[PDB]
Design a protein around this ligand. Structure first.
Ligand SMILES: Nc1ncnc2c1ncn2[C@@H]1O[C@H](CSCC[C@H](N)C(=O)O)[C@@H](O)[C@H]1O
Ligand SMILES: Nc1ncnc2c1ncn2[C@@H]1O[C@H](CSCC[C@H](N)C(=O)O)[C@@H](O)[C@H]1O
Ligand SMILES: Nc1ncnc2c1ncn2[C@@H]1O[C@H](CSCC[C@H](N)C(=O)O)[C@@H](O)[C@H]1O
Ligand SMILES: Nc1ncnc2c1ncn2[C@@H]1O[C@H](CSCC[C@H](N)C(=O)O)[C@@H](O)[C@H]1O
Lengths: 184, 184, 184, 184
C-alpha cells in the first residue's frame, strides 16, 4: 500500500462520486497536511480526500448530507483504522459546521456557495488554509473572485486518459477544473 | 513542512530545470512508494522526485550527467539528511545504470530514448514500475508507442496558473505533458 | 488568394496585435456574414476581422483609438479596395459608436466592459448578432455572465502550434480563449 | 444563409457523423479554396466539408464507402444546387481514387493510413495541398511523422461548449484534435 496520495479509486468504498486519483494527488499537494493538523472536508462524498489527509498523519472531520455516502465514508474510516482521527458527520454546510472545533485547513469538495464563503470568513481563524475545486462555470467565477479578493494560487487543471476506440486509442473526454489554494 | 509530494519548488536547491510542484505530485502518485522500495531516477536534474520519493520512505539512486546539477542534488541530500537513503551518480543512462542494483521503480525525466527503453526492458525485474514524463512531440510519440506495446496508463496533462497581465489576470501559457505509467 | 476567412497573418498590414488566423476563422464563422450586412468592429487593431467580413460581402465600420494602428487598418482598406465597403473611425467605444448607423452584427475584440455591453444592450436592434473573444480572467468572467443572462453559444478554445525545441519539436504555449456568440 | 464556412450542422443532411461547425471553419481555413479548384474529400461522411468548399467556389469529389452516408452527401449536393461541381463517389480510398482527375487539394477526414499516404505521394502532382484531421492516438502520430518528414503547419485544437449541469453550466466533455496542413 502506497505511502503517498493519488491511491487508486478502488482503494475506497464509494458510489459513482469520488475525487479521481490524479486530482486527489493535486488536491493533497495543495492542502499540505502536517502531522496532527485538522481538516474540514466540506463536500465529503466517499471521504477519499479525508482518508489521504489522515494517512498523511492528519486529523479530519468530513461533512456530508447524503446517508448512502456517509456509509461509504464510515467504511473507509474502519478500513484504514482511522477512528478517532477521522469523524463522519451527516449534515449540510454551513449550518453543520456550527458546533465543530476550528481547523487548520479546509477543503471545499462540494457545496461551495457565497453563503459558505461568508460564514467561513466569519468563523475561521485568520491564516486557516483553504483549498477548493470547481467544475461548474459558476463555481469557477466564484474561485476567480476569491482569487481577486484574497490572492493565493489559482490553477486550471486538465487531465485525460488514453482509452479504447475501438481498434485504436482515444483521449477520454475531459473537463477542466479550477483549483484555488489560499488562506483565511 | 508538508507530509506529501508536490512541495513548493523553493524547498529544493535547483537551477531552473526542476519538476514543477503539481507535476511532481502526479508523478509520485504514479510512482507509488512503499516503505524501503528502491528508485532509479534517470535525469535527476535537481533530484526533487527522489527527495519526495525518499521522504515517503523509499531509497533512490539519482543519475545526472551535469556536475553543476549534481551539486544541487547533493545539497538536497544534505538538507533533508537523506545520505543513508539517497545516492547521486554523475553520469549518463544507460552506462551509469550498469553496475547499480535493480530497482523496485524507475522514473525517466531524463533523456528517454528507444535505446534506454530496450535496455530497461532487458534488465528490469518483471513487475518493476515505470513512470515517464514527455514534453516534446518526439518523446510523447515514444510514450504512446510504449503504451501500445505494454499497456499501463497514459495521461495527458495540462496545468496552467493565474498570472498577471497588465492590471488584469491571465492563464500562464503551458504545454500539455504526457505521462506514462506501466510495469515490467 | 483564399476565398474563406482565416487567411494568413501576412495578408494584412499589422503591428503585432492582429487576431491569429485560426481564431479569425472561428470568429467569422460565428459572425456569419450575409451579403451587404453591416458590422461594428470594436477594437479594430489592424482590422483583419473587418477585412475578412467585407471580403465575404459585408460592409463594416472599424473602431480603433490608436492612430498608428488606424494607419494599418487604412492600408488594408487600400490593399483590398474596400473603401466603398469599409470605414475606419479613430476613437473609443462607446463614444465613437454614438453617431454610427446601427449594425446587423457587432464584434468586440476591443476593450469590452460592462458599460459597453449595457450601452450595446440599450442601443441595438433586437436580433443583432454579437461576438466577443476574451483572453483575461476578467473578460472571460464577463462573457460567462453575458451567457448566463442572454444565452447563445459560449466556446472555450485552445489552439497550439508545433514549434521548434532544440532539435526536437514542442507545442507552443497557448492560452485558452473564450468566445461568446449571441444576439439582441 | 452565411457567406462563410462554419455553417450550422443543421444546414446539412447527416447521420450522427459530421465535422462540427467550428472544426469545419478551421478545416476550410487550412484548405484555402480558390475559385474552380478541385478537392478530393477522402472520408466524406455527410460531405459537409465538400459542401463548404464548393460554396466557396470550388469543385469537389467526395469519396465514401457507406451507402447511407452517400445518400446524405447527395441530398446536400441537390439542396445546394451543386451538380456537377460536386460528385458523390461510393468507394474506398486509396483504391477508389485510381480513375479520378488530379486535384489541387486533398482533405483526409477519415481513412488515413500509411497506405493512403504512400499512394498519395505516388499519385499526386507535387505541391498539391493536403489537410488532415486526426482524433485517435495512432492517427496523431501519423500526422506528427508527416510533419517531421514534410513540414507544414501542425495544430492541436481543443474546443468545448458551455452546457446545462443541471442548475449550473459545465464545459462539454472535449477531445483534442490534431490537424496537419501541408503539401505534396
Ligand atoms: N452544502 C453541502 N455541504 C456538504 N456537502 C455537500 C453540500 N452540497 C453537496 N454536498 C456533497 O458533496 C459531494 C460531491 S463531491 C464528491 C467527491 C469527494 N470530494 C470525494 O473525494 O470522494 C456530494 O456527496 C454531495 O452530497
Ligand atoms: N542521458 C541522460 N541521462 C541522465 N540524465 C539526463 C540525460 N539527458 C539529460 N539528462 C538530465 O535530465 C534533466 C532534465 S529533467 C529535470 C527535472 C528533474 N526530474 C527534477 O525534478 O529536478 C537535465 O538536468 C539533464 O541534464
Ligand atoms: N475602448 C476601446 N475602443 C476601441 N478599441 C479599443 C479599446 N480598447 C482597446 N482597443 C483596441 O483593441 C485592440 C486589441 S484586439 C486586436 C485584434 C484585432 N481584432 C485584429 O484582428 O487586428 C488594440 O489595438 C486596442 O487599441
Ligand atoms: N478508407 C476509407 N476511404 C474513404 N472513406 C472512409 C474510409 N474509411 C472510413 N471512411 C469514412 O469516413 C467517415 C468518417 S468522418 C465523417 C465526418 C465528415 N468529414 C463530414 O464532414 O461530414 C465515415 O463516413 C467512414 O465511412
Amino acid at each position: 500500500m502506497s505511502q503517498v496520495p493519488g491511491r487508486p479509486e478502488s482503494a475506497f468504498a464509494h458510489d459513482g462520486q469520488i475525487t479521481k486519483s490524479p486530482m486527489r494527488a493535486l488536491t493533497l499537494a495543495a492542502l499540505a497536511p502536517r502531522r496532527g493538523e485538522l481538516l474540514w472536508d466540506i463536500g465529503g462524498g466517499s471521504g477519499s480526500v479525508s482518508v489521504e489527509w489522515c494517512l498523511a498523519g492528519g486529523r479530519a472531520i468530513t461533512i456530508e448530507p447524503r446517508a448512502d455516502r456517509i456509509e461509504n465514508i464510515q467504511k473507509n474510516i474502519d478500513t484504514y483504522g482511522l477512528s478517532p482521527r477521522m469523524r463522519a458527520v451527516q449534515g449540510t454546510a454551513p449550518a453543520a459546521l456550527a458546533d465543530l472545533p476550528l481547523p487548520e485547513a479546509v477543503f471545499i469538495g462540494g457545496g461551495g456557495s457565497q453563503a459558505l464563503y461568508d460564514r467561513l470568513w466569519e468563523w475561521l481563524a485568520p491564516g486557516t488554509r483553504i483549498v477548493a475545486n470547481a467544475v461548474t462555470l459558476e463555481s469557477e467565477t466564484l474561485l476567480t473572485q476569491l482569487h481577486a479578493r484574497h490572492g493565493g494560487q489559482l490553477l486550471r487543471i486538465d487531465i485525460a486518459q488514453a482509452e479504447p476506440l475501438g481498434r485504436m486509442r482515444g483521449w477520454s473526454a475531459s473537463r477542466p477544473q479550477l483549483q484555488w489554494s489560499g488562506q483565511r
